[PDB]
């Protein structure tokens, strides 16, 4: 199949879906397309926008610092329900079209940017799994184990092939194919540790953070060469980069449950998480500057994980000051999902534009 | 204005201010121009040679390791005093440029090396912050916490914007425009962190520690692979190379003070230290081959740097070994500042050549 | 003499040993060249695999896991025995070659690819120093620094100047030069570290393994980005990735010995060697296709140290499911010895195949 020099040649755009004004398509572009093919694989962002929400409105709910405010449980109960019942729709939907439209989707799966969302399928069903309600789960000390090996089996085995053709002569490298986006698989690790370490296994959850540590220190440098991969780091400041605060904030809530207390490992890795934030929020240039797109949903994923890591950490230093910033940042987050989650209805039955013709994967082989 | 593509085609040298035997420039080359404009921004390494002396003085005669030697507490005094008066009188001079010479500043903070010696006049402050002499502090428990404010205030500000352009596409990244001296940008939040510590804000000196440690990670590696900037590291080996010990000296002292004692985070950036320490003074070809120049005197800042974290070190290992270490890098440090000093005199009265004409501010626009 | 852009430029292979289908040499090629100059310095790599093999078979027989086998110490014995051997036949032989053919050694000194294999005959010696048998000395309490100074010395004075020439302009930068097998030099550090605490001096180790530490992280990195070196690094999987291994694995051993037992920062360097394992052995294609050379031997090299460090890991989280991977690791890593073993005496005295004319070192300068 094409290679990504020739998805790096005729798609531009921050996310790389857009056609250039000189490259011919193989479809036509007025007649409208079956359902499916229109069908892109970026709508998994909802279930991880949702699935997070889920994960920190229970921190909120059971974690011993914020709790005069008196938050009832049933947030978690009514979301998490929700938040199933559309993961449950995307992915019955995609699977018919790999039945049908196998051939489109092996597009896809070439995409220099699309590849990595493979991985969100794997990963929404970890928070899910991490954050069940106390309702349905009575008495529970451990998890079975059946639930990690399940769930994490899939994302390791296809963890190896992806990895494995980094440090290669193989066309798909981390030099010749890399973004902002690429973040994302090398963030399961890190939540993986925390499902292991609920089902018992502790020794088994430290492999894990080795193995995420090592390839995000990799894919953090690179991103500040000059790597072939031109056109996708969007100029001046892009949402596109909130990926990077997705990785520090999940590694620093893993190692709180293997090692119980923040140590020197957990304080540094939530700072360096801050750092981003602050630098990527703290402009007027943010709140004012902002177009709905369906890639919007999945940039509230590390906006909602950080909210999570920061009222672990005022559980260890209790104070006003602590406090503050825990009760701050899960409000920002939140509220850009409730803006979201309003606007997507409009466009979906008010304006009917959320699912246009996917011009991205009609790019003639060669020139 | 200029970019740094017409400032690393157009001035070639260590330092990069010197015009190549091809360039035509804006401004006569013998006429003698006015003095401000004479004046360049590398003028503030004196106060960075002069201000790190007076730390390292103050451990001599403090410290319980080195004390047999009796080292009388006036000396500090003498030199901080003597180490405010240039400081007042550099930071004065300079500023009456803005006003009548605005323009030419604007392209200073636009030249690749030039730009990263801004932050030397917040840097000199806080060394004379956090070595006050005792005199004039008696009964000093904790310092005001407004000291580290001011002080701490305009350099986050500013450290914001050139950290954040380095992961975009506008033409300032860490790729384009780099050099030896880029660590001076990314020292300040270690040698920040001191000064935290000495007001009674201690979790707030970890945020700087993160922060100072993820930079320079990406400013280290980012140094030994091919990047854009050519005839900047200068061939075999030189003096410039003497600001990759400033970093992780001042990441050593730090973490003895958050934390108290040193742990393994404190010798193994020590180790680091020394060892690029050994590479750059261990010749027969560095001793041997010296000429004066202005930016000798930003040189020394490393080189005393070093002294000040030994002799902690010798704190929590006494013994023979350990005091023979402390007690000589501390004197080589401070042999070159006499014989700087003595030579910047003669420079000054009897030659009159330390300020000549500026060449690498009149590069032309274009070709 | 040549640079490296000339051995980039003609010779093609993994190793780099096998000259192109247009370029010309200086030595006719169906006549046999003397012995001396077909004896390459790849020879080493047959005492790097035997003395590691002393190591691992020390610990199956005096570890307190793994001992219900009940393994006789008489294997150290004699496979230490024998390896010495081999040492000072290689040794001896390769002398002769500098004495009679000093201008062939030189060209092999700037070859890209074995200018790091000449540190194979210190890390060798090391090997048989830190796993003496019990019986050559009783009553061992620790042994005498004269062993760490003398073995230790050369390398470290060599280790310098290769070091010191990648923060630099010159021609042999990590850019310009860098293969899969640049590790070699950077293993030696770590192991070093193991010698040191074995006679005393325990401080002395810690300097050693900061040094290893920072330049891994600089190779580790570096081989994962764009870099002149084209042809060297093999498409798809190939064994000569196996030296990946070496280092985190020699230096997950240094850390059990200075500060005695598993901390978070042994573990941590196991798990990240043991995904490389996995990665590079859990193939159907690599126990498929073999074929004999003499690269081989030293690709067990970092196949056997991972052996060593997983039995200290069984040691402290006793179980049996450490006890099954320890014990099949070192089975695995053994095979393939037995197997070279054999096979080599076949090449030797049945095909006569193991030295035939080194077409590598006849290049012609230029074109
Ligand atoms: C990969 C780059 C972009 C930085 C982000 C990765 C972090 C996970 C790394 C960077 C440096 C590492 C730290 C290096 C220094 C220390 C201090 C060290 O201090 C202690 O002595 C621990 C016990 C204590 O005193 O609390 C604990 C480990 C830790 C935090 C390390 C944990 C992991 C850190 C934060
Ligand atoms: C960025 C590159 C060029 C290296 C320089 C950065 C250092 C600040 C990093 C590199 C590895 C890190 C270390 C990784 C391993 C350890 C060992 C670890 O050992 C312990 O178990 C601490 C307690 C003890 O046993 O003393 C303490 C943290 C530390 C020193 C880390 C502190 C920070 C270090 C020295
Ligand atoms: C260079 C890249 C490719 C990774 C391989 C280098 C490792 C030697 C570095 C990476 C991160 C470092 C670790 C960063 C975080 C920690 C956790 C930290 O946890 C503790 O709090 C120690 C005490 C304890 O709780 O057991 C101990 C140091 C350690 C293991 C560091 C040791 C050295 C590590 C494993
Ligand atoms: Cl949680
Ligand atoms: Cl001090
Ligand atoms: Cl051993």
Redesign the interface.
């Known amino acids: 199949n094409v290679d990504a020099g020739r998805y790096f040649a005729a798609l531009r755009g921050p996310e790389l879906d857009e056609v250039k004004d000189n490259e011919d398509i193989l479809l036509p572009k007025e007649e409208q397309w079956p359902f499916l093919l229109r069908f892109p694989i970026g709508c998994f962002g909802i279930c991880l926008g949702l699935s997070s929400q889920a994960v920190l409105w229970l921190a909120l709910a059971k974690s011993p610092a914020t709790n005069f405010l008196h938050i009832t449980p049933l947030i978690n109960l009514v979301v998490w329900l929700f938040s199933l019942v559309v993961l449950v729709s995307v992915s019955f939907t995609y699977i018919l079209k790999c039945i049908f439209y196998f051939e489109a989707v092996k597009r896809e799966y070439f995409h220099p940017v699309r590849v990595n969302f493979f991985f969100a399928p794997w990963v929404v069903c970890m928070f899910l799994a991490i954050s069940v309600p106390p309702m349905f789960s009575p008495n529970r000390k451990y998890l079975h184990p059946a639930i990690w090996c399940v769930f994490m089996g899939p994302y390791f085995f296809l963890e ?1 092939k992806i ?2 053709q ?5 066309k798909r ?4 194919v890399a973004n902002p986006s690429s973040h994302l698989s090398v963030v399961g690790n890190f939540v993986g540790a925390i499902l292991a370490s609920k089902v018992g296994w502790d ?1 088994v959850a ?2 894990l ?3 995420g ?2 390839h995000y ?2 894919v ?9 991969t031109s056109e996708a ?5 892009h949402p596109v ?1 909130s990926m ?1 605060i997705a990785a520090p904030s999940a590694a620093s809530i893993a190692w709180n449950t293997i ?1 119980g207390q923040f140590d ?2 957990s ?3 939530f ?2 998480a ?2 981003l934030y ?2 990527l929020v ?1 402009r007027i240039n943010f709140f004012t500057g902002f177009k709905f797109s369906v890639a919007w949903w999945s940039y509230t994923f590390p906006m909602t994980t950080a909210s999570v890591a920061t009222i672990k950490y005022a559980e260890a ?1 209790p104070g006003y000051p602590s406090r503050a910033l825990a009760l701050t940042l899960s409000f920002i987050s939140t509220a850009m999902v409730c803006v979201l989650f309003v606007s997507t209805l409009l466009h979906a039955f008010v304006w009917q534009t959320l699912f246009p013709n996917d011009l991205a994967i009609a790019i003639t082989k060669r020139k």
Not at 173 to 176: E, F, G, M, P, T
Not at 233 to 237: D, F, M, T
């Open positions: 190896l990895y494995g980094w440090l290669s002569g193989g490298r981390l030099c010749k020794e430290k492999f953070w080795a193995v540590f090592a220190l990799v953090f440098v690179t991103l500040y060469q000059r790597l072939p780091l969007p100029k001046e400041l980069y990077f090692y020197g490992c304080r540094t890795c700072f360096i801050l750092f602050i630098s703290a230093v």
